[PDB]
């Protein structure tokens, strides 16, 4: 839910959801308070290798 458009006028601005649209099965796992899948400037493999 973090990578959804923050400028669209959602019906639930904090959750970034609309009223009648279907809800993801793992919605409570992606609520901008938890794990997000937003793209990063560096590739995931590169970050993992560098940190390790």
């Amino acid at each position: 839910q973090q990578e959804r458009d923050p400028w669209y006028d959602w019906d639930h601005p904090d959750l970034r959801l609309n009223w009648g649209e279907p809800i993801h099965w793992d919605l409570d796992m992606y609520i901008r308070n938890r794990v997000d899948t937003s793209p990063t400037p560096v590739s995931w493999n590169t970050m993992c290798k560098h940190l390790f």
Binding site: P13, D14, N33
Partner: protein, 459 residues
Amino acid sequence: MLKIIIPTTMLLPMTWMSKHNMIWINATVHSLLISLISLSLLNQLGENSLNFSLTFFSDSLSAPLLVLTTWLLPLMLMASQSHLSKETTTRKKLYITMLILLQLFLIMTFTATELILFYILFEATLVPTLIIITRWGNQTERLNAGLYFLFYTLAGSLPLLVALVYIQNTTGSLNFLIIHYWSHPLSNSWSNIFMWLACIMAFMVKMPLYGLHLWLPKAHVEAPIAGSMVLAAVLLKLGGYGMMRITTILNPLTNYMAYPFLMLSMWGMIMTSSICLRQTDLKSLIAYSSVSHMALVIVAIMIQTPWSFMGATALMIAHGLTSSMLFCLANTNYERVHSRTMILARGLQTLLPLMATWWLVASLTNLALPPSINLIGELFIITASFSWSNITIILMGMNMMITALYSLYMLITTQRGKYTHHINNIKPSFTRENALMALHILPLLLLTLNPKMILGPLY
């Protein structure tokens, strides 16, 4: 002991003779007076017990549970006052009668000098709870829930009865005092193994154990608010009381037999705490938290050390109060929103600040913040288990971390953020609800001043 039992019985004719608009006032006033009377039982001794007669005796394990049982009834009436407004007078009187019968059964169960009388009342508590769940529940699943809540219990308790009478055929008595004074070791035999299982599983199903916990979310979610309070606060502690009372005759077989149940509880507290993290239901979350706490209490009772028993007593009392408060808060949200889903009603701290304060205090005390009695019981159990084995500390630390995580998750999801725009029927909190939360929370912070009052007979 009759000075408490007789007024509870007299609560019934007074309720049935009360005016159509004075049932709640009379019931609340006289229940509070009965609780004040029951407070006298807290004066225990370092000697044997308070043996009133051949039938009823008290103990510093029985007294805190009796006080909590008496104190819970006025809160149950105050919370049930709301959703029973459109009910006929006869049915309101029947609901109050069910509550009074439940209180009387619990009071007579907790004293119960004899084991068969204890069993009779321990099963007698089933009927009013089943009627309350299956008659004044809202959804269509309540009936199913009731079935579960019944049969699970009986599946564990009918063998126990057999074992009990068998013991009375060999020992010659079932009196608690004679059983303790004449206890003999249990030889490691298959017959003794199955006697141990029959004596134990009836109480382990009511805690409940991790493998046998399926009935609890159904019963808690489907029952009305008073049913949820009485289930989470007192009815779960009957199994702990029974195990504490009955493990005396099971030694030394407990050392070998406790391993499967210890493993089940130590892993199930982690499993249920993780389950709480992904929950779309408030009542289900509170129920699973109750399951985790009672798994810890099971570990404490199975380890069978003085610190374990003290911590278990403290944790049962603390969890009863805290879980009742949490269920009350969720019910106050539900009576406004009518959905019972965490994610729908959001940003409630901005609209109801004092209720948000109550939420914060309840979450803090569920999270076992020192010097609350929740933390006292948690820490005593953890220390005893560490003495039992140093590797338990990993599991207990994991459980503490996940408990904090899901408690603050439940607080933040409902109280913080931005309010739901379309929800506009959120009225200011009533004096009744605020008084209910205050009466839930003040005894906890008063008891943290005098912990020895809830530390059991091994203090």
